[PDB]
């Protein structure tokens, strides 16, 4: 909707696992915009088509570009869901670059944060698989 999504994304960094702090800004996503997220385990965090394409069908390349660690139980997610923005909405965005590259990956992907993901994003099409 109209909350400070940049500040929400920033708040999840600087302690615990993700101790590095990225640069976060607010952008208005447009109705009909498409973003992507891992599945299962939908969260407030998404990425753009450019980031997905740069991974070349490799989950390790994708999650390293977003500096996301493998899930403690399930490991890296192997399925990607596309979502469609239902209405103009604020997202927090920037580059995932500030974590330790040895542990997290070199980063460089474009991230989005939307706390209102459950109500503002509609899944579109089937999930699709990505390789190792």
């Amino acid at each position: 909707n109209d909350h400070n999504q940049a500040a929400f994304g920033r708040q999840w960094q600087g302690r615990g696992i993700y101790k590095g702090r990225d640069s976060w800004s607010n952008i208005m996503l447009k109705e009909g915009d498409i973003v992507y997220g891992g599945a299962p385990g939908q969260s407030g965090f998404y990425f753009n088509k450019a980031t997905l394409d740069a991974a070349g069908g490799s989950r390790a390349k994708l999650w390293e570009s977003l500096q996301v660690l493998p899930h403690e139980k399930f490991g890296y997610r192997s399925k990607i869901q596309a979502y469609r923005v239902k209405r103009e909405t604020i997202a927090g965005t920037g580059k995932a670059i500030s974590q330790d590259p040895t542990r997290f990956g070199e980063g460089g992907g474009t991230q989005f944060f939307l706390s209102n993901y459950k109500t503002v994003l509609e899944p579109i099409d089937k999930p699709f698989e990505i390789g190792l």
């Binding site: 302690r15 101790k19 407030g44 403690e72 139980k73």
Partner: protein
């Protein structure tokens, strides 16, 4: 079984020792399955997972992930670790503090008589939530996880660490 030395940051559980002087050769041993988490095929693995299957822990199997400074070397030092029992690890928490982190601190306090967070010149341990993975764990960042002194001092101010 579980103790934490709050003067130097060393965790002992299920016969495993996780401290600031723990090396790869010291940790990654015994009949225990340690797996790369993630594996790197060029052999540059730096993070490892083990799962403790204790038949006395009400909260279930304990997932541990340990992170080292560098690839290959027998003497790479631990820079961080985290753990949680299965029953307390997974769930939605919408803010930095909520039920998942509260329930992890409760459990840890029951086990050790230690109220998290704890910290010092060695690092910082607290329950924390990963909003990408929808998991909570007891997270330790040791001083060697910080590549610069200014990163360490800013972290100390943000996280109320005083020594």
């Amino acid at each position: 079984m579980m103790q934490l030395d709050t003067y130097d940051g060393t965790l002992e559980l299920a016969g495993i020792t996780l401290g600031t002087a723990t090396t790869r050769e010291m940790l990654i041993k015994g009949s225990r399955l340690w797996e790369g988490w993630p594996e790197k095929s060029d052999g540059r693995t730096t993070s490892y997972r083990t799962i403790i299957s204790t038949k006395k822990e009400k909260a279930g199997d304990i997932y541990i992930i340990a992170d080292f400074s560098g690839a290959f070397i027998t003497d790479a030092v631990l820079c961080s670790w985290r753990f949680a029992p299965e029953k307390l690890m997974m769930g939605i928490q919408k803010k930095v503090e909520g039920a998942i982190t509260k329930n992890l601190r409760t459990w840890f306090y029951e086990k050790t008589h230690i109220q998290l967070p704890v910290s010092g010149s060695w690092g910082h341990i607290d329950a924390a939530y990963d909003p990408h993975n929808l998991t909570g764990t007891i997270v330790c960042n040791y001083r060697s996880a910080f590549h610069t002194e200014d990163e360490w001092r800013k972290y100390c101010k943000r996280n109320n660490i005083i020594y």
